[PDB]
Design a protein around this ligand. Structure first.
Ligand SMILES: CCOC(=O)c1ncoc1CNC(=O)[C@H](Nc1ccc2c(c1)CNC2)c1cc(Cl)cc(C2CC2)c1
Lengths: 156, 39
């Protein structure tokens, strides 16, 4: 199937009509998305099949066709862009200054932008266009709004 | 059954709409990969 680098919608025809369950990144022949989007199931790309290669429920990440390739990190200072790919809507870049998720195991960037659940897996970019993480796993704060972690894998 | 559809190139857009705040939150991450607020 199509292996061109880019952002892709993750769709299903099991429910009513065609439904977008999430988004992902094709880079260096590997498809990267969040574990909760596919639950590790195989994907179809045209007539081709993409088999899972690596996954982890705690990181909430999964790669297909090869090992995780995305290794860019947020610098802790600069604004970033969410390349939001919402269901039924065109890809749209939204620029923001990330906040921080402080944990017992270290700090990670966080983006305070609200999108439908089917947007999970949309990439977060630095000024060079490099993918510093995926948007789509986070928390609901006091007022009811959504704050996502900047989830990044490890390049072995 | 799941399938993928291309949606675009991965590029930074000069003059994109700037929005969202930068909250600093104490959070916990459990074995099921679920985040929670620490208070
Ligand atoms: C489910 C009860 O409510 C919450 O806990 C909750 N509500 C809002 O955010 C959450 C936390 N979860 C997520 O970030 C969520 N995806 C998710 C689903 C399953 C797993 C994981 C992540 C990681 N482990 C397995 C999500 C993402 C986006 Cl863009 C939009 C949404 C709206 C539909 C609420 C949800």
């Amino acid at each position: 199937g199509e292996t061109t680098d880019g952002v892709y919608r993750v769709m299903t025809r099991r429910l009513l009509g065609s439904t977008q369950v999430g988004v992902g990144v094709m880079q260096e022949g590997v498809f990267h998305t969040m574990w909760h989007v596919t639950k590790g199931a195989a994907l179809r790309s045209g007539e081709g099949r993409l088999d899972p290669y690596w996954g982890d429920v705690k990181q909430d990440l999964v790669s297909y066709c090869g090992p995780w390739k995305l290794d860019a990190a947020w610098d802790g200072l600069s604004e970033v862009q969410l390349l939001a790919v919402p269901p039924g809507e065109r890809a749209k870049n939204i620029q923001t200054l990330p906040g921080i998720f402080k944990t017992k195991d270290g700090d990670i960037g966080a983006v305070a932008l609200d999108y439908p659940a089917g947007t999970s897996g949309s990439p977060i970019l630095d000024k060079c266009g490099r993918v510093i993480g995926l948007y789509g796993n986070g928390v609901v704060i006091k007022n009811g709004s959504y704050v996502s972690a900047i989830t990044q894998g490890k390049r072995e | 059954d799941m399938y993928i559809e291309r949606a675009g190139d991965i590029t930074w857009e000069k003059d994109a709409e700037v929005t969202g705040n930068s909250p600093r939150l104490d959070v916990a991450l459990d074995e099921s990969g679920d985040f929670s607020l620490v208070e």
